[PDB]
Amino acid sequence: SDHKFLTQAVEEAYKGVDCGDGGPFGAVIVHNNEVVASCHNMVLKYTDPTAHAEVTAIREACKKLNKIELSECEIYASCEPCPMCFGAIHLSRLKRLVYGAKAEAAIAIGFDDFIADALRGTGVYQKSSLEIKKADGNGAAIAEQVFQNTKEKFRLY
Amino acid sequence: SDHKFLTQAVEEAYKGVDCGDGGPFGAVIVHNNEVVASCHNMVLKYTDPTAHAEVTAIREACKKLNKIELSECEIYASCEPCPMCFGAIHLSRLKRLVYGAKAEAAIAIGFDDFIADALRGTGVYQKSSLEIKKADGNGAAIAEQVFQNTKEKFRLY
Ligand SMILES: CO[C@@H]1[C@H](O)[C@@H](CO)O[C@H]1n1cnc2c(=O)[nH]c(=O)[nH]c21
Ligand SMILES: CO[C@@H]1[C@H](O)[C@@H](CO)O[C@H]1n1cnc2c(=O)[nH]c(=O)[nH]c21
Ligand code: NA
Ligand SMILES: [Zn+2]
Ligand SMILES: [Zn+2]
């Protein structure tokens, strides 16, 4: 299950950067193995710097389920969510987060050094008790290669 | 000019609570004394937990200026922005943030303890660069009074 949905997020990243919607980032929100939302970064398409893949997926899933909490759903991110996106995941009350690549893989291709303290447990004020799983092995390697692969295909933002 | 725009953000908070759009939070984005956006929390109206006042103001200002960065603009928040909102403020490259009430004022009336380390200067992985001003005197009094005046005028989220 984890491998399938992380793969779907990676494919969303590739698709979004291929059609010019935004950067190579994907996010899939799932409710008991039923995909509620499958989105990618829409910053360029929407002219919205908040339209990251995770925030877009949360918005879509919440309007689809007609409620502002997703306590029965889990989110799969192709890359480690940024501070804004992790805050949005916290506010969404999503019960589990699985992400593929570490943020350093995205920083390596010139992206801003923007890492969520609450995700890595390095904060004084912001804490998290959300279940967080960093993928390993297969899906992790594939997700880390995304930034070196999608790199001549978009301009940084 | 700070007091005027902070008071406008507080007025937005009151209006949003009256409308039932969301909670008592407002945000005003300006460009050299010209209001670019004036928003309040729209979580209940939009069925969107990311639709905080600050995120909504950022979206609307970026739509108005036809770009994803607001380096020439400043933001006034009625209350101390949450981690998600401070991350959005960082991504939007706003040059200055002026906030009225400390987050403890919102916590005292039933909101979650959800405080941004980067705003208070305790961040390790996330480090802010923008100028930050906490309101004093009459602006602080107004922004703090917002939560005492709106208690049980809205549904908590
Ligand atoms: C990586 O890095 C980067 C930098 O820092 C900035 C840019 O501007 O942000 C980030 N990003 C982007 N895109 C995205 C999504 O989609 N999601 C999330 O989470 N994040 C993100
Ligand atoms: C304060 O407290 C609270 C809790 O914690 C959570 C909820 O759930 O968040 C927060 N909030 C709300 N609303 C809002 C806006 O509008 N803006 C911002 O910033 N923030 C916010
Ligand atoms: Na408005
Ligand atoms: Zn993000
Ligand atoms: Zn917020």
Author numbering:
A (entry chain D), B (entry chain A): 29 to 185
The paper states:
In plants, guanosine deaminase (GSDA) catalyzes the deamination of guanosine for nitrogen recycling and re-utilization. The other involves the hydrolysis of Gua to guanine (G), followed by its deamination to xanthine under the action of guanine deaminase (GDA). Both deaminases are zinc-dependent enzymes, which rely on a catalytic water molecule to attack the amino group-connecting C2 atom to proceed with the catalysis. The zinc ions are tightly bound to the active site, coordinated by the completely conserved residues His80, Cys113, Cys110, and the key water molecule. AtGSDA catalysis needs two key sub-processes: the activation of water and re-capping of the active site, which proceed via the two critical residues Glu82 and Tyr185, respectively.
